[PDB]
Each structure stands twice: as C-alpha cells, then as structure tokens.
Amino acid sequence: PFELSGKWITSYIGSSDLEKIGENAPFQVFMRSIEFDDKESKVYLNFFSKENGICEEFSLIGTKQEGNTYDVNYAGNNKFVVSYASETALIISNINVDEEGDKTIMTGLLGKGTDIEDQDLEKFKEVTRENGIPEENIVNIIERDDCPA
C-alpha cells in the first residue's frame, strides 16, 4: 500500500516555457509536502518559491477533479496529475494557464529530500520528453534549493 501523502522535496523540473522556471519565476517550486485528502477530495501543497531573491512559503489547497486530475490556483490556473509514484519518488505533470492565457506544460520529480535515485530520474526525463519538453529545459532544483526545511 503506497503512501503518497507526506514529505516531498523537488529535485528536477522540466517546462515547455523557460520563463516560468528560471530564477525567481513562479514555477521554480521547492516542494516541502503534499497531502492527499481523498475523503474530502482535496490536496494540500506546501512549498517555497523565490521572489526578489528571498524565500516565500506557500500553502495551497487544490480540489480533485475528473480522473486523477487536481485543480489549484497559483500564477494562473493549474491542472496537475501524479503521473508516477514509487516509494522514493513522485512525478507531477502540470498544465498552467497564466493570467495572460499562455499555456505551459511542466513536469517535476519529487523525493524524500535526499538523494536522487537514478531510476526515478530516468522516468522523470522520459515523462518530460513525452510531454514534448526538451532536455535543455530541465533545471536542477536541489542545487537551487537553499530555502528553509
């Protein structure tokens, strides 16, 4: 029985739009924890993001929708799905439509902080590729995560 809820840190993030994941961008998300409240059909996302260089924490609440999709507001509208789940990682596929209406597809590899297991990384890169996102559009989040634990 897989436990999806708990501590989850971001290791890598791929994106179709580089403007959304650079330094201080809305999607350079340093995950801290994700909670799946299936009884209440909600999802609790906690993370840090940089704006003007300093770390800023976020505690969002998303609602479960059709299939395995989750709706959540942040820098536009988002619809994300947990494409992959193992005992060491989680791979999220998210589609964001910002305030300007620009559509951006993104992917992310989440772990228990730690150390990255190449097995999950290869799956992340494969998912990223399948979404038409090139390898050069992948950023290493762990190297950039200096935000509070």
Q: Which residues here bind ligand UNA, judged by CB under 6 A?
A: 10, 27, 29, 31, 34, 45, 47, 72, 74, 78, 80, 92, 94, 106, 108, 110
What is the per-residue DSSP string for 104-126? EEEEEEEESSSPPPHHHHHHHHH
Q: Which is closer to ligand UNA, CB of 110 or CB of 133?
A: 110
**Least gap, CB of 131 to ligand UNA (angstroms):** 13
By beta-carbon proximity to ligand UNA, the closer residue of 27 and 36 is: 27
User: In angstroms, what is the minimal distance from the CB of 107 to ligand UNA?
Assistant: 8
Paired tokens of 66: 């059709």
Residue 45 C-beta: closest distance to ligand UNA, Å: 4
Kind of pairing, strands 70-73 and 54-64? antiparallel
Q: How far is the CB of 96 from ligand UNA (least distance, A)?
A: 7
CB of 83 to ligand UNA, least distance (A): 11
Instruction: Point out the residue whose Cβ comes nearest to ligand UNA.
Output: 108
Residue whose CB is less far from ligand UNA, 21 or 146 = 21
Question: Which residue's entry shows tokens 């959540």?
Answer: 72
Which CB sits closer to ligand UNA, 54 or 91? 91
Buried b (16+ CB within 10 A) or exposed e, 107-126: bbbbbeeeebbeebbebbbe
Give the Cα separation of 92 and 47 in Å (integer).
14
Other beta carbons within 10 angstroms of residue 93's beta carbon come to 21
